[PDB]
Every structure is written in C-alpha cells, then in structure tokens.
PDB file of C-alpha atoms and ligand atoms in Angstrom:
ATOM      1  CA  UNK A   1       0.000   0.000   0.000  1.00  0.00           C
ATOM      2  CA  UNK A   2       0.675   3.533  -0.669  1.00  0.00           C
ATOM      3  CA  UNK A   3       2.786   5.623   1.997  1.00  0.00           C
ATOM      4  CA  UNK A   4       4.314   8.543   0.208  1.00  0.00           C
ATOM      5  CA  UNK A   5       6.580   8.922  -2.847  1.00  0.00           C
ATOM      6  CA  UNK A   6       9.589   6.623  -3.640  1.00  0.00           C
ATOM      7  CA  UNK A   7      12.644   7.867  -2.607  1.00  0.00           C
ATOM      8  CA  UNK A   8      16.553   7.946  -4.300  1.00  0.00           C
ATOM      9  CA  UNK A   9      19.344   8.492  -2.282  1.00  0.00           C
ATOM     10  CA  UNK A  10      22.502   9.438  -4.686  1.00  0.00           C
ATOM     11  CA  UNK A  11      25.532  10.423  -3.757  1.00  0.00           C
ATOM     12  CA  UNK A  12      27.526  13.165  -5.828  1.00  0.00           C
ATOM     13  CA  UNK A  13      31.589  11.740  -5.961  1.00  0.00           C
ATOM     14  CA  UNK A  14      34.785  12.586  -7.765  1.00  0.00           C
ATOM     15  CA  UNK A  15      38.090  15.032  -7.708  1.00  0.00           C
ATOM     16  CA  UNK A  16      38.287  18.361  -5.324  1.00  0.00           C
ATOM     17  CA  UNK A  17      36.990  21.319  -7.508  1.00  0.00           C
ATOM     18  CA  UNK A  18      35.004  19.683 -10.409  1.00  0.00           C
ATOM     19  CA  UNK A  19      31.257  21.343  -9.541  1.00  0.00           C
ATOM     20  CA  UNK A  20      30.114  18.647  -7.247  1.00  0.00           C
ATOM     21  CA  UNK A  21      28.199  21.039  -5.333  1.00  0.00           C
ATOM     22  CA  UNK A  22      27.811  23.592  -8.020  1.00  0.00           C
ATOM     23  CA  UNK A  23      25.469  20.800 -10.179  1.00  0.00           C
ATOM     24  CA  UNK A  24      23.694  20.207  -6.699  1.00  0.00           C
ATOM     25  CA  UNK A  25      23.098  23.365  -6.340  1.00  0.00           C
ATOM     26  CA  UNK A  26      21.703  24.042  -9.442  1.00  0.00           C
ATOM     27  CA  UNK A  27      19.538  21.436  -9.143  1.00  0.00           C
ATOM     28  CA  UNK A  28      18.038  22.276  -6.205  1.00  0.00           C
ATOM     29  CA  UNK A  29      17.841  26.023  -5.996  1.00  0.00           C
ATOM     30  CA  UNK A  30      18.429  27.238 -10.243  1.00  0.00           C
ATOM     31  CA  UNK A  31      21.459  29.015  -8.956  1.00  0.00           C
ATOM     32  CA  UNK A  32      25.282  29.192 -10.108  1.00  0.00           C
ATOM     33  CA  UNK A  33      27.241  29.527  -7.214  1.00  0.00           C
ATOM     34  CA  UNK A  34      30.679  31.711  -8.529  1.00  0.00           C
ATOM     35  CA  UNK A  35      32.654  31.186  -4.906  1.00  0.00           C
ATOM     36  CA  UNK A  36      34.787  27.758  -4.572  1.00  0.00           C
ATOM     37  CA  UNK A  37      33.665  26.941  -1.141  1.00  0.00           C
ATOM     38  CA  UNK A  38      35.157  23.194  -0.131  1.00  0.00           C
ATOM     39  CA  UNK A  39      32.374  20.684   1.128  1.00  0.00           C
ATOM     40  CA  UNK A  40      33.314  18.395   3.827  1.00  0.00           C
ATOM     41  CA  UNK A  41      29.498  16.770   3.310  1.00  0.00           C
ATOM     42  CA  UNK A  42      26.129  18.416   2.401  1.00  0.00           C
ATOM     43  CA  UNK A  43      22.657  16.712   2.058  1.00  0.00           C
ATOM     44  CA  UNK A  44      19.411  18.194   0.225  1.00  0.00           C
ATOM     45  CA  UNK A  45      16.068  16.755  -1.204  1.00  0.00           C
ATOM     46  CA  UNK A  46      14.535  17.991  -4.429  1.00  0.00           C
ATOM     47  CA  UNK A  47      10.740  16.469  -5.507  1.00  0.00           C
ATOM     48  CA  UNK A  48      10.544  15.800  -9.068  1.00  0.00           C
ATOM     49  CA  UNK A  49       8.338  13.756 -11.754  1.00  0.00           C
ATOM     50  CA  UNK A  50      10.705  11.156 -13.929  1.00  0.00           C
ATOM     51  CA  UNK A  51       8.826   9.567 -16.168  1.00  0.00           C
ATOM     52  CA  UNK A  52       5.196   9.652 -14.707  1.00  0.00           C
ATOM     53  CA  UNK A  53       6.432   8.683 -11.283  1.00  0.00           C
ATOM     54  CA  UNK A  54       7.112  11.454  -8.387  1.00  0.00           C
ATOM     55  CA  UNK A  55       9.765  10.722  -6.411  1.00  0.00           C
ATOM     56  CA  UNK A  56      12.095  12.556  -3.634  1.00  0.00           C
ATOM     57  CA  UNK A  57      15.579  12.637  -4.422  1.00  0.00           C
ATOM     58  CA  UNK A  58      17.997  12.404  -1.468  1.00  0.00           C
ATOM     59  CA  UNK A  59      21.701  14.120  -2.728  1.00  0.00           C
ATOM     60  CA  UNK A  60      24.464  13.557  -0.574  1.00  0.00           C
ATOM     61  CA  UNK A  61      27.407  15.642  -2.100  1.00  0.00           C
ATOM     62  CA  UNK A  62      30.283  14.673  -0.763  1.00  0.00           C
ATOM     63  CA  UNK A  63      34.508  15.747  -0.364  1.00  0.00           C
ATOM     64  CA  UNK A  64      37.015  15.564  -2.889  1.00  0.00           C
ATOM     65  CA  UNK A  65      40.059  16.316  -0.686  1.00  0.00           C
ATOM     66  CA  UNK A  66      38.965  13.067   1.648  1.00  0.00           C
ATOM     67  CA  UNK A  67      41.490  10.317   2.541  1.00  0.00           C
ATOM     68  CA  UNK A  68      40.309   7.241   4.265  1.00  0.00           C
ATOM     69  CA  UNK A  69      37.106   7.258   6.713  1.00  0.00           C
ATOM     70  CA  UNK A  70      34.990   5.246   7.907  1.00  0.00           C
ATOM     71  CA  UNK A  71      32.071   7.776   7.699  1.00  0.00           C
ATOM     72  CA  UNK A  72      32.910   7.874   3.655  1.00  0.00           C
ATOM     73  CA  UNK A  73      32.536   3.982   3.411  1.00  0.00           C
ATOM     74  CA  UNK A  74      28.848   4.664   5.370  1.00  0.00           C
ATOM     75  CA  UNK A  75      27.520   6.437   2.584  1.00  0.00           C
ATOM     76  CA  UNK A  76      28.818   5.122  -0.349  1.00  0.00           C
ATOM     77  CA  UNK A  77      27.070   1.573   1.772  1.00  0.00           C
ATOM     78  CA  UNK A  78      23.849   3.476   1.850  1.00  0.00           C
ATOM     79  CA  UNK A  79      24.030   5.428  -1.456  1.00  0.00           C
ATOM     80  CA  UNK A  80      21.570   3.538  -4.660  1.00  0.00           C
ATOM     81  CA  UNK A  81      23.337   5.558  -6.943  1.00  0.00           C
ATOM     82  CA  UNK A  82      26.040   7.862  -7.916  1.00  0.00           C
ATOM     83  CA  UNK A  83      27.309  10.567  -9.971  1.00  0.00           C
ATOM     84  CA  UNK A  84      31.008  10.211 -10.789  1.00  0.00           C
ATOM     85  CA  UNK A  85      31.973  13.547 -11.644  1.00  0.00           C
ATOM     86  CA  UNK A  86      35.028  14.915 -13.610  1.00  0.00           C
ATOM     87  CA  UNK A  87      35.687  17.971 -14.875  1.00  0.00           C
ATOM     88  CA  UNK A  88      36.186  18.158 -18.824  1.00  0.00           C
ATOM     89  CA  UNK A  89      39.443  21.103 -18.417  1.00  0.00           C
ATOM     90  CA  UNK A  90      41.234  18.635 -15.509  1.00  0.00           C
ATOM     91  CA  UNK A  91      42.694  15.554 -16.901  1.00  0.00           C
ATOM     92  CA  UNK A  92      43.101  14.335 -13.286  1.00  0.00           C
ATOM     93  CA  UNK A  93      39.955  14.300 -12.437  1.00  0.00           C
ATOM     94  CA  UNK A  94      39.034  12.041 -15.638  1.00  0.00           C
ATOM     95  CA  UNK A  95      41.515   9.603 -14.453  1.00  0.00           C
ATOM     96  CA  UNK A  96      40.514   9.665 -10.756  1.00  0.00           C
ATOM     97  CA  UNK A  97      37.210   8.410 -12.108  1.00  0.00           C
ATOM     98  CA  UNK A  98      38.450   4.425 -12.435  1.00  0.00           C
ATOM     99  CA  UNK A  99      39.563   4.992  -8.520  1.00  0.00           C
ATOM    100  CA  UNK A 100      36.082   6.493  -7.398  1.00  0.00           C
ATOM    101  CA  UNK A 101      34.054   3.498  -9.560  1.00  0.00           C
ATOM    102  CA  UNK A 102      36.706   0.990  -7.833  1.00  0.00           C
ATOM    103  CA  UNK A 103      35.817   2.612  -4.127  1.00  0.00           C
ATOM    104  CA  UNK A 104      32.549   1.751  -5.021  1.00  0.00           C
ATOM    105  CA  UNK A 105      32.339  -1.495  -6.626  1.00  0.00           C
ATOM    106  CA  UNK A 106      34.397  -2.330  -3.686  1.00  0.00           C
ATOM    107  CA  UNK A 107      32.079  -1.405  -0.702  1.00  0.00           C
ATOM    108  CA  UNK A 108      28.952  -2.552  -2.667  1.00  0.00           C
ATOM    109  CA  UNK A 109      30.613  -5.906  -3.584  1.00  0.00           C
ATOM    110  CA  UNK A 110      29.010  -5.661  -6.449  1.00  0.00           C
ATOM    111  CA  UNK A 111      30.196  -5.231 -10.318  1.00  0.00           C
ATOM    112  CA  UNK A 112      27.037  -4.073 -11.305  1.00  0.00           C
ATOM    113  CA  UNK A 113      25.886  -0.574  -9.533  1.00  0.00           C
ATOM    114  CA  UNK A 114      23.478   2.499 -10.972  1.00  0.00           C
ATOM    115  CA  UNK A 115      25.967   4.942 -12.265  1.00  0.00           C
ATOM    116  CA  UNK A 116      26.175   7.939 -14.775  1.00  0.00           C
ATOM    117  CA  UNK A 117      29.696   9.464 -15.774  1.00  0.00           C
ATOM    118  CA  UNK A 118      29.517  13.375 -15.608  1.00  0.00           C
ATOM    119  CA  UNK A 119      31.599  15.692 -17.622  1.00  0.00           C
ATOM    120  CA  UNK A 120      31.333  19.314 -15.845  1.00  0.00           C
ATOM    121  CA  UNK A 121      32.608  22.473 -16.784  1.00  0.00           C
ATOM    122  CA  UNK A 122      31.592  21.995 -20.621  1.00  0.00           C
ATOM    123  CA  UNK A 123      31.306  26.081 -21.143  1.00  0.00           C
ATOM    124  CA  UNK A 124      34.525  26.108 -20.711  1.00  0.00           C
ATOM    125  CA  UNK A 125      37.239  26.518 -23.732  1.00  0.00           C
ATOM    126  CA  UNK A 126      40.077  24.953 -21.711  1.00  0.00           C
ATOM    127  CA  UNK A 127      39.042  21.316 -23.033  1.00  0.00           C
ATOM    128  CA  UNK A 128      41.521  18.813 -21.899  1.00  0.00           C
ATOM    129  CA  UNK A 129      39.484  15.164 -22.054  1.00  0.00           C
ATOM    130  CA  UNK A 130      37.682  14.609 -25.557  1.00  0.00           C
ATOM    131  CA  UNK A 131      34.071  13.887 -25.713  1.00  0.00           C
ATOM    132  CA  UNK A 132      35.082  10.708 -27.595  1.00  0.00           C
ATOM    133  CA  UNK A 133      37.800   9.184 -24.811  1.00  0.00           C
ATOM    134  CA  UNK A 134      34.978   9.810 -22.123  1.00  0.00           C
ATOM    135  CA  UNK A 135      31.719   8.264 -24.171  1.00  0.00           C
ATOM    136  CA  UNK A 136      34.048   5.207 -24.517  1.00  0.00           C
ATOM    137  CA  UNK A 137      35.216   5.264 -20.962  1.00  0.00           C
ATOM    138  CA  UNK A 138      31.691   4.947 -19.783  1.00  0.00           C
ATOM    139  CA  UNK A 139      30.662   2.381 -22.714  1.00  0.00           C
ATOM    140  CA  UNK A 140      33.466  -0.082 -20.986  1.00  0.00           C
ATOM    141  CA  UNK A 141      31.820   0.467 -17.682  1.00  0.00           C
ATOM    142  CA  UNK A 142      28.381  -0.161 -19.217  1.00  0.00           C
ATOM    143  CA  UNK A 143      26.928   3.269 -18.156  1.00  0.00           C
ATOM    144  CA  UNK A 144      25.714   6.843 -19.217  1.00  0.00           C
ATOM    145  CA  UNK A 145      27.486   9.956 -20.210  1.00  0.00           C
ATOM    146  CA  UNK A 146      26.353  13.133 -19.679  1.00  0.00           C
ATOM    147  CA  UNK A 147      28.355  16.493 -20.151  1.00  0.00           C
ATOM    148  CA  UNK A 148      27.027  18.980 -17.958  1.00  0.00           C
ATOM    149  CA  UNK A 149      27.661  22.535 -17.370  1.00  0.00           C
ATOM    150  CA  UNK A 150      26.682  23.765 -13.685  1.00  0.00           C
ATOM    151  CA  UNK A 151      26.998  27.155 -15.390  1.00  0.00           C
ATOM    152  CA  UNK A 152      24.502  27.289 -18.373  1.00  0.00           C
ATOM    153  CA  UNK A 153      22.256  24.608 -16.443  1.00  0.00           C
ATOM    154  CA  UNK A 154      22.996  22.498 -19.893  1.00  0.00           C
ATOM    155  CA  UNK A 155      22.517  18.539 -18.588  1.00  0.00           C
ATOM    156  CA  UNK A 156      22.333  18.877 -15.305  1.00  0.00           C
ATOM    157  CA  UNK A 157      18.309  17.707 -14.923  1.00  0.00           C
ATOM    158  CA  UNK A 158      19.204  15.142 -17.514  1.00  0.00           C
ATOM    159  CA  UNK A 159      22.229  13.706 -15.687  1.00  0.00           C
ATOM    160  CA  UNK A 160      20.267  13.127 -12.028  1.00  0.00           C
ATOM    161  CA  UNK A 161      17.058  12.330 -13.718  1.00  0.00           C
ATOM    162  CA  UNK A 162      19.218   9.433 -16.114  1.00  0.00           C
ATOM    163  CA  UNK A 163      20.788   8.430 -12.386  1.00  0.00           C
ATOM    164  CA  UNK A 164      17.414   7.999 -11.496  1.00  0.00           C
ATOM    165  CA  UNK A 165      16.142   5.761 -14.377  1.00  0.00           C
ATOM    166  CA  UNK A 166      19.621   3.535 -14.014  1.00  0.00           C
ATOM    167  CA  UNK A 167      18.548   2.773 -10.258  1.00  0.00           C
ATOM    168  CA  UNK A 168      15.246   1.728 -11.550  1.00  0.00           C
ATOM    169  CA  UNK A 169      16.588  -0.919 -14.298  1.00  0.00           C
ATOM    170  CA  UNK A 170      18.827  -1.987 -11.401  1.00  0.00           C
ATOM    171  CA  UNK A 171      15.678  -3.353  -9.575  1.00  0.00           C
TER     172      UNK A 171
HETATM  173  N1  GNP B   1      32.714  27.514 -15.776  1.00  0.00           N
HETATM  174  C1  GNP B   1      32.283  26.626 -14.868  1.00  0.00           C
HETATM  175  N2  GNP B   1      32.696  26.719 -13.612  1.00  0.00           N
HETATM  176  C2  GNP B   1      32.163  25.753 -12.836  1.00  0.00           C
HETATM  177  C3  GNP B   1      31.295  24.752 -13.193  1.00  0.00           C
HETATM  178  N3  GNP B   1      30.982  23.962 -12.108  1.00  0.00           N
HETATM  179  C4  GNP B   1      31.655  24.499 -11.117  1.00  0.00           C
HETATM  180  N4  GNP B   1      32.396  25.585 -11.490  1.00  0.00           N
HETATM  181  C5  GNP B   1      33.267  26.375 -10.621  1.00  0.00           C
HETATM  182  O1  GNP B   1      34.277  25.526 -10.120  1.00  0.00           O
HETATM  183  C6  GNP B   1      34.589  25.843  -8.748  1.00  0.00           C
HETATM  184  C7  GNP B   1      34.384  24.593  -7.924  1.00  0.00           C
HETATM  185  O2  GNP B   1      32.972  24.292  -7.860  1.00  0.00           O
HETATM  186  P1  GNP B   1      32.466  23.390  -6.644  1.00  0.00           P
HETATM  187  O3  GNP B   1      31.027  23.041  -6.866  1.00  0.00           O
HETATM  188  O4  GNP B   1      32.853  24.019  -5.336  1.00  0.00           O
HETATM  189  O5  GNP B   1      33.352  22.062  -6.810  1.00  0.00           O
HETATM  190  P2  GNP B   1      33.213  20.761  -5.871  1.00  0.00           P
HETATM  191  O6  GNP B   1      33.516  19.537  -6.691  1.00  0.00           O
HETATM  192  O7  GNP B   1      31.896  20.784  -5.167  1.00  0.00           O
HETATM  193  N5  GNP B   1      34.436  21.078  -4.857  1.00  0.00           N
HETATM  194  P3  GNP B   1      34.712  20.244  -3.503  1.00  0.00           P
HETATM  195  O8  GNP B   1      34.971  18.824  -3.907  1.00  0.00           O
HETATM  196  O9  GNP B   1      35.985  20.752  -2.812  1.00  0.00           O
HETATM  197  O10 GNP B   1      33.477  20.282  -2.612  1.00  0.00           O
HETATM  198  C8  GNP B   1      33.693  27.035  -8.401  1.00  0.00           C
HETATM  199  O11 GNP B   1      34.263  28.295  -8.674  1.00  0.00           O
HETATM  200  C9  GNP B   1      32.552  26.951  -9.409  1.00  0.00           C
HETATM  201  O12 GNP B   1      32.051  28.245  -9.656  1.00  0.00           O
HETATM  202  C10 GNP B   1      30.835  24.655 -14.519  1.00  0.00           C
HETATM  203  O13 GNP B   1      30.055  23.811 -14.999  1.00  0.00           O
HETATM  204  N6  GNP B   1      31.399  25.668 -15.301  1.00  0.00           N
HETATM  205  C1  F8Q B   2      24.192   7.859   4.263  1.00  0.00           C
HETATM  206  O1  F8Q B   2      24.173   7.867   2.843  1.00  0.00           O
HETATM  207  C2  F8Q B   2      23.310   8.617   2.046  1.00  0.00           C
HETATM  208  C3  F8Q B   2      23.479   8.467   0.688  1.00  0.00           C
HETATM  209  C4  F8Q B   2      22.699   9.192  -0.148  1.00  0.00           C
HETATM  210  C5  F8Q B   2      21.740  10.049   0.360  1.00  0.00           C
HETATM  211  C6  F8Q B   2      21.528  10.204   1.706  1.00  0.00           C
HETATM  212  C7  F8Q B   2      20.513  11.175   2.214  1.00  0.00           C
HETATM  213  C8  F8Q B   2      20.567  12.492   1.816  1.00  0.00           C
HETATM  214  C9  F8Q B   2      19.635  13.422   2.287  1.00  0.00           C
HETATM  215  C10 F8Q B   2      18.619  13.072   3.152  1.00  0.00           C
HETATM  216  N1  F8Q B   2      17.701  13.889   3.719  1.00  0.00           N
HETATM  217  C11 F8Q B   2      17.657  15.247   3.858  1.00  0.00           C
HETATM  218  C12 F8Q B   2      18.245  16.171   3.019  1.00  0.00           C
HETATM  219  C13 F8Q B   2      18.199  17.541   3.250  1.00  0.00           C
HETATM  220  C14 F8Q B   2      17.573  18.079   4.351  1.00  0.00           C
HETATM  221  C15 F8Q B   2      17.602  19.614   4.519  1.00  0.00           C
HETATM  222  N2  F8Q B   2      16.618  20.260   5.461  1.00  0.00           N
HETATM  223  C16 F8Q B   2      16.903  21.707   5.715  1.00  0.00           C
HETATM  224  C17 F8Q B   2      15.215  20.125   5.002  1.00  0.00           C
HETATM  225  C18 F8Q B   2      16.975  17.164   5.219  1.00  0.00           C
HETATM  226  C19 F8Q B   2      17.017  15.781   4.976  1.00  0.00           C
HETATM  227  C20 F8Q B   2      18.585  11.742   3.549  1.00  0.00           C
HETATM  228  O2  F8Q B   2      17.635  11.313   4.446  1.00  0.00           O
HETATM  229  C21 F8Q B   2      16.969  10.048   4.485  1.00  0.00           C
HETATM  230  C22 F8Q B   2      19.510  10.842   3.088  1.00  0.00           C
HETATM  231  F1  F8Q B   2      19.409   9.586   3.498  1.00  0.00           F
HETATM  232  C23 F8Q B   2      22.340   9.493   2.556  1.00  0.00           C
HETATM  233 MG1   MG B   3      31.249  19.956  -3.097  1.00  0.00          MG
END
C-alpha cells in the first residue's frame, strides 16, 4: 500500500573542484554559485516527476580532498546511486574516475551498480578530455554519459534524472 513517494538516495563523488556542489546546487535552488567553497558533506532533497512517477531525491554531495574514513565507506554503503563527476578542463579528475568506480564497486561488492559518468565544466574553452575518450570510458563500464555545465544549467536535470532511471533498471 501507498505511503508517500519513492525515494533515491545518490551520492555526488569525484576530484576536489570539479562542480560537485555547483550541479547540486543548481539542481536544487536554479542558482550558479561563482565562490569555490570546499564541502566536507552536504545533504538536500529535491521532488521531481521522472517519467510519470514522483519521487524525492535524497543528494548527498560529498569531499574531494577526503582520505580514508569510515564515515565515507557509510555512505557510499547506503548510497543507490552515484554521480562520478570529472571535470572536462582537468585531466586528473578524468583519471581519478576508475579509482572512485573501484571505491565503489568495492564497498557494494558488487560489479554491477546504478551509475552515470559526468563531464562538468563543458562552457569552458580549456578542453583537456575529448568527448570521444569519455563516451568510450563509460561504454566499458556499461553506463551513461552526460556532459554537464553547472553554469549554463545544460545537462544537469538530464544527468540526475538518467541516475534515477539507471537505479530503476537496477531493480
Ligand atoms: N565555468 C564553470 N565553472 C564551474 C562549473 N561547475 C563548477 N564551477 C566552478 O568551479 C569551482 C568549484 O565548484 P564546486 O562546486 O565548489 O566544486 P566541488 O567539486 O563541489 N568542490 P569540492 O569537492 O571541494 O566540494 C567554483 O568556482 C565553481 O564556480 C561549470 O560547470 N562551469
Ligand atoms: C548515508 O548515505 C546517504 C546516501 C545518499 C543520500 C543520503 C541522504 C541524503 C539526504 C537526506 N535527507 C535530507 C536532506 C536535506 C535536508 C535539509 N533540510 C533543511 C530540510 C533534510 C534531509 C537523507 O535522508 C533520508 C539521506 F538519506 C544518505
Ligand atoms: Mg562539493
């Protein structure tokens, strides 16, 4: 029987500095924050409709600059799907992807968990990591790609709404 909405909890991952909490925040409140103000850990709830179905999104967005807790290995426990984000002017960060996925296939003993590759910062002119090298990046893990900007709002709905729909397959 009915009790309320379905509800997502997703977790927001990947390098210090690629618009973890700049996508979040444009999600929630259609606002570009300018200021690079480090996140230790942030949660927020947004309602939405995804294909005919309402449902309450839970977003935890989470550190880059984190070594080794316990608290970190909680959530990514919890967490029914994530956003793996790089940053398309950071080559780092696109390579600090395979250790984030590994994190979590590791704590979720699991090969097989919801996922969606993000490529921020696409206003940007400074392009470091090709389109092409990041589509086939995600085609060898079996998941979407999305190229967001936080900026012009381009993707952003699209890449935690197609989070959203991977979690669903998933069960
Ligand atoms: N041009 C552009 N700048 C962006 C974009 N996303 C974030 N930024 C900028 O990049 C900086 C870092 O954004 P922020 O959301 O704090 O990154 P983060 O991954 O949450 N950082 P942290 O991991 O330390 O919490 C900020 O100045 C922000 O304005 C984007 O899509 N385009
Ligand atoms: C521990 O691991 C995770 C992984 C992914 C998501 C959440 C999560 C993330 C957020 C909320 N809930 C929440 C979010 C924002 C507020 C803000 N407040 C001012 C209304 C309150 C509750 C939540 O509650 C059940 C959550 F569970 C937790
Ligand atoms: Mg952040």
């Amino acid at each position: 029987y009915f009790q309320g909405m379905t509800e997502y909890k997703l977790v927001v991952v990947g390098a210090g500095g690629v618009g973890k909490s700049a996508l979040t925040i444009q999600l929630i409140q259609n606002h570009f924050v300018d200021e690079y103000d480090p996140t230790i850990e942030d949660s927020y709830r947004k309602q939405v409709v995804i294909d005919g179905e309402t449902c309450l999104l839970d977003i935890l967005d989470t550190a880059g600059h984190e070594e080794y807790s316990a608290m970190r290995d909680q959530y990514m426990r919890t967490g029914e799907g994530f956003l793996c984000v790089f940053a398309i002017n950071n080559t780092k960060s696109f390579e600090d992807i395979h250790h984030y996925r590994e994190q979590i296939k590791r704590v979720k003993d699991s090969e097989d968990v919801p996922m969606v590759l993000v490529g921020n910062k696409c206003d940007l002119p400074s392009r470091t990591v090709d389109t092409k090298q990041a589509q086939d990046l995600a085609r060898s893990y079996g998941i979407p790609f999305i190229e967001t900007s936080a900026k012009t709002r381009q993707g952003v709905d699209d890449a935690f709404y197609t989070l959203v729909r991977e979690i669903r397959k998933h069960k």
